[PDB]
Amino acid sequence: VLLNFLKTEQNQGTRREAIRVLGLLGALDPYKHKVNISDYSTSEMLVNMGNLPLDEFYPAVSMVALMRIFRDQSLS
């Protein structure tokens, strides 16, 4: 949330204040930043790892496309 405002909010004073905050806190080395922190088969279907013939391939991809919008409740 410190960095998100740099690409969303644009008012110059706000950005100067944000970077000032970052500087005062100051340069955490990324290692500690990381320390503090199924679609797999469908992904292989997107590449056809199983080497299916194209005829039995279009149904799978069209289906996964339809399920992608059908699962999301935001646009029902």
Cα 26 versus chain centre, distance: 27
Is the Cβ–Cβ distance between 47 and 60 less than 8 Å?
A: no
Give me the DSSP letters along 46-58.
Answer: HHTTT---GGGTH
CA separation for the pair 76, 36 (Å, rounded)? 37
Nominal resolution in Å?
Answer: 3.3
Question: If DSSP codes are grouped into helix, strand and coil, which group holds residue 27?
Answer: coil
- For 32-36, the CB contacts below 8 A with 24+ separation are none
CA separation for the pair 64, 70 (Å, rounded)? 10
CA separation for the pair 43, 58 (Å, rounded)? 15
Distance linking the first and last C-alpha atoms of the chain = 30
CA separation for the pair 19, 5 (Å, rounded)? 10
Placement of tokens 């088969």 in the chain = 41
CA separation for the pair 40, 28 (Å, rounded)? 34
